[PDB]
Amino acid sequence: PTIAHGDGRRPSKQRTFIVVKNCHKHHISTEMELSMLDLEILHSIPETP
Amino acid sequence: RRRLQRRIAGLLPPPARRLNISRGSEFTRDVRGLVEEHAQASSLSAAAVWRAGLLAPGEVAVAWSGWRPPVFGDFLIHASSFNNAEATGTPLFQFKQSDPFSGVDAVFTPLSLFILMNHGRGLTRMANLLYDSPATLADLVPDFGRLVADRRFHNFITPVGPLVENIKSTYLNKITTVVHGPVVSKAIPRSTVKVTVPQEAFVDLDAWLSQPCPADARLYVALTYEEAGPRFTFFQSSRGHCQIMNILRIYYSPSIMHRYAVVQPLHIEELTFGAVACLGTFSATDGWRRSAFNYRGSSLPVVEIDSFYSNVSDWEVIL
Amino acid sequence: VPISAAVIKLGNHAVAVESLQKMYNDTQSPY
DSSP: OOOOOSSOOOOOOOOOOOOOOOOOOOOOOOOOOOOGGGTTTTTSOOOOO | OOHHHHHHHHHOOOOOOOOOOOOSSSOOHHHHHHHOOOOSOOOSOHHHHHHHTTTSSSSOOOOOOSOOOOEEEEEEEEGGGSOTTOOSSOEEEEEOOSOSSOSSOOEEOHHHHHHHHHTTOOHHHHHHHHSOOGGGTTTTSSOHHHHHHTTOSTTTEEEEEEEEEEEOOSSEEEEEEEEEEEOOOOOSSOOOOEEEEETTTEEESTTTOOOOOOSEEEEEEEEEOOTTOOEEEEEEESSOHHHHHHHHHHHSHHHHHHHHHHSOOOSSSTTOOOEEEEEEEEESSSOOEEEEEEOSSOEEEEEEEESOEEEOOOOEEOO | OOOOOEEOOBTTBOOEEOOOHHHHHTTTSOO
């Protein structure tokens, strides 16, 4: 909104702002390793202590 | 010795080759078990990882199939030596820097590799729009003119194949390229990727000739040495490498005597008229659908080799 | 009818004090 005036100016009419904000993106990632000797025997079934 | 029977039970079953289906609308479990190829990316739960089966040795199996897992070479380049509006499917070229301990490599896409050729003498409009200053690229090679002048530029650049993922960093950009294997993206919606090469740089060699059609027609790169500045052209063909050298000699037959007429070969190293390298194979039927590539201002014509299989070779000299 | 302004005390006088900076800077005219 604005103020009306008594004295002379060229007054602004009803202003109205439209402002948009776009999103960001963040792509966080890391890397782990796993030995195949801990993956083959993981994918087997043992019967030995 | 009965446990060996259970071991051979766990080892026997190949992928299903035939399947006597009866109707189509029924959608039996057996035909689903034929057509279900396991995934590569899933949500993070141990039951979800177990159904996705990513812990299986080598190839994926729920507790070999003619399919190969792709490798992913990683590179580091300065942020100004690359434009983040490059397409996903574009081939890349490594230039070996001269420092012994480097860490940060130097990769050229053909759009960027164009302005290493034009400065010093449409498509060139876009190549000057994206990489605005040649001076930000003229220094990654330290001695370009001497290296063109003795014609040992081709054995310094090894192709690395197409691009996949560009994490748009601030200063030291990290890109991932497939040097070998099925070119497929690492995205959470795993979208298909099509290798693009700009149209004016890419002349077909099949319809350039204007019954035996195989399935794998290869894609060849070719650096050529011109006295008007060297050029990088690309080639699609369904022939053997023995055929590719002869038909490329017949294709470059004007340019060789063009260079012979303008510049006499005073030394013994100028006689190398560039080389070729197999960049890999793809589908010979659905090949090279055209497409368009927009930057913010303009649009160059561009081909799209779809579902590409990357396989780099060395350089074989054209002569 | 309650009104909203801070009030200080000066001897016999209990003068209230208010600021119209907020009441004009929302309208972007100089105070």
